[PDB]
DNA sequence: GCACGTCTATTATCCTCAGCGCAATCAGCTGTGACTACCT
């Protein structure tokens, strides 16, 4: 979040494209072979793009 | 910068199977009338 602003555009800072991070969901982790500790706080907050998302 | 045509999508709902008791079905017997042939 700290990344150096190489300018302003309108207002708006833009920022070099070399700063994109990925993540992955409980079910992307279990595919892995990996186990969410109970009780973690989610690290992101997306909109989801499941059925069951987009029917709610 | 805005509206239209086009490509694509991280778990839900609807037509068909499984033992007993009641009703449908047939076999056998009879009635009712006539038709018909052989013998006394």
């Given at each position: 979040?700290?990344?150096?602003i190489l300018g302003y555009?309108?207002?708006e800072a833009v920022y070099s494209?070399?700063?994109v991070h990925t993540l992955?969901?409980?079910?992307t982790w279990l595919k892995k072979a990996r186990v969410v500790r109970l009780g973690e706080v989610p690290?992101?907050?997306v909109k989801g793009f499941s059925?069951?998302?987009?029917?709610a």
């Open positions: 979040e700290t990344a150096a555009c309108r207002g494209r070399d700063c992955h969901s409980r079910d690290y992101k907050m059925n069951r998302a987009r029917k």
